């Protein structure tokens, strides 16, 4: 009955953009006007999803204070991009990813508009915060307790008539937070109140196994920038002369020729349709970021993780192990025979398999992009009648 003008505040990067786009499309499907702040790198992708784009220039084009400060400057960059573009015509709603939460909430404070937080990672409240656990494990102070960071945030927050102490503002919970995870994957899930919606992951003729009885393995380390020909060769060697059929997605940087001849039961591709392979897979060998792990569990496929290939993968990998949904290979266990052994043990573990099938069920019932849009619209109902 109402068209809403909805502004997305998001940082550039595959991991931050991709999970959001299903929601952007479902809201545009519903007749809402989507504006989305991003860089030229993701502009075309965001427009294809149905949104109008506001371009910002990314900063990513004492080491931790510098990581902290640039983080602040990136929020400032997105903040100023959105203000200049929208100007004397505020949107109805600000939806922002956790990374630019400074930008998002300040836009909402400056326009007097409600906001929604988006997260493709674990939710935070007073009982669990992944960010607090990370700072702790690295012996870092909370950024708010860092003078140089604290100083800039005081200035920034004052400009926007915010007098809230920096550490508290930092820890405030949004009116609504859409969490793109199934609830059972969330640490301390039971403590998370009504303002948190665990909606799960957003998600060519496809690939078909050449031999219908063959156990299928998917190997992927994402679309890496740095190249691991050695690992893919070791995987090829590991499953040569076994009943397995192995599909290796090597990304857009590595030339499949580089891997040399492959046996007939191993295939390598820069790009593969992941879900079509996972639908047939008995296991998946992967880096273990949140995205990768949930795609596998959405298809009921147990995991062997190699989290040293992905820096973000640590918390997600840790959770997989914690829940008994997969195993992990250390960098000293990457000889072909070791890879084989780990994959076979995991694939044969019927306890892990049943846990993963229950996770598949929890993903399915989570609700997806349609529910995430229903949540957005419902929220707008409450704070904007």
- Residues forming the annotated binding site for Ca(2+)? 41, 45
Q: Which of 3, 29, 31, 44 binds Ca ion (CB under 5 A)?
A: 44
> Can you tell me which residue has the tokens 């007097």?
112
Q: Which of 4, 14, 142, 233 binds its own copies (CB under 8 A)?
A: 14
Binding site partner of 141, from Ca ion, its own copies, Cl ion, none, Cβ cut-off 5-8 A by kind: none
45 vs 59 by CB, closer to its own copies: 45
Chain positions contacting Cl ion, by CB under 5 A: 119, 123-124
Instruction: Give me the least distance between CB of 41 and Ca ion, in Å please.
Output: 5
Alpha helical stretches, state H, the chain = 14-29, 40-48, 63-86, 101-111, 130-137, 147-159, 166-171, 229-239, 274-280, 290-298, 313-322, 336-347, 350-364, 368-383
The Cβ of residue 232 has, within 10 Å, a number of other Cβ atoms equal to 25
Residues 290-319 that bind its own copies (CB under 8 A): 298-300
24 vs 149 by CB, closer to its own copies: 24
CB 177 within 8 A of CB 121: no
48 vs 67 by CB, closer to its own copies: 48
Does residue 194 sit in helix, strand or coil? coil
What is the per-residue DSSP string for 104-164? HHHHHHHHT--EEEEESS---SSS--HHHHHHHHTTPPPGGG-HHHHHHHHHHHHHTT--S
Residues 191-230 that bind its own copies (CB under 8 A): 203-208, 212, 220, 222-223
Q: Which of 50, 229, 324, 336 binds its own copies (CB under 8 A)?
A: 50
Who contacts 311 (Cβ-Cβ below 8 Å, separation ≥6)? none
Q: How many chain residues touch its own copies (CB under 8 A)?
A: 53
How far is CA 49 from its chain centroid?
Answer: 17
Binding site for its own copies (CB under 8 A): 14, 18, 21-22, 25-26, 28-29, 31, 40-41, 44-45, 47-50, 203-208, 212, 220, 222-223, 249, 251-252, 269-276, 278-280, 298-300, 364-371, 373
């Amino acid at each position: 009955m109402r068209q809403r003008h909805i502004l997305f505040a998001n940082v550039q990067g595959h991991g931050h953009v991709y999970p959001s786009l299903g929601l952007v499309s479902e809201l545009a499907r519903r007749g809402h006007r989507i504006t989305y702040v991003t860089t030229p790198l993701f502009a075309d992708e965001v427009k294809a999803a149905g949104a109008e784009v506001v371009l910002y220039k990314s900063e990513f084009d004492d080491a931790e204070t510098q990581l902290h400060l640039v983080y602040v400057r990136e929020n400032v960059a997105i903040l100023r991009a959105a203000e200049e573009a929208l100007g004397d015509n505020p949107p109805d709603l600000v939806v922002y990813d956790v990374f630019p939460f400074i930008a998002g909430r300040l836009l909402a404070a400056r326009w007097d508009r409600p906001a929604v937080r988006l997260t493709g990672g674990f939710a935070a409240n007073e009982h669990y915060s992944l960010f607090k656990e990370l700072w702790k494990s690295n012996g870092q102070r909370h950024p708010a307790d860092v003078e140089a960071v604290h100083s800039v945030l005081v200035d920034l927050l004052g400009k926007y008539g915010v007098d809230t102490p920096v550490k508290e503002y930092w820890d405030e919970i949004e009116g609504l937070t859409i969490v793109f995870l199934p609830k059972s994957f969330q640490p301390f899930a039971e403590t998370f109140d009504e303002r948190f919606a665990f909606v799960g992951p957003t998600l060519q003729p496809g690939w078909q196994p050449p031999r219908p009885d063959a156990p299928v393995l998917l190997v992927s380390l994402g679309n890496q920038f740095n190249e691991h020909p050695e690992f893919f060769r070791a995987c090829a060697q590991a499953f040569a002369d076994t009943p397995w059929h192995v599909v290796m997605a090597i990304g857009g940087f590595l030339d499949p020729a580089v891997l040399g001849p492959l046996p007939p039961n191993v295939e390598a591709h820069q790009w593969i349709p992941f879900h079509s392979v996972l639908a047939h897979a008995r296991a998946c060998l992967t880096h273990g970021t949140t995205g990768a792990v949930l795609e596998a569990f959405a298809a009921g496929v147990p995991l062997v993780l190699v989290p040293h290939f992905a820096t973000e993968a640590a918390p997600s990998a840790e959770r997989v192990i914690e829940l008994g949904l997969g195993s992990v290979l250390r960098p000293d266990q990457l000889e072909p025979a070791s890879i084989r052994e780990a994959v076979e043990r995991l694939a044969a573990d019927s306890a892990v398999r049943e846990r993963v099938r229950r996770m598949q069920r929890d993903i399915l019932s989570s609700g997806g992009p349609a529910r995430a849009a229903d949540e957005v619209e419902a929220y707008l109902g409450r704070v904007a009648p």
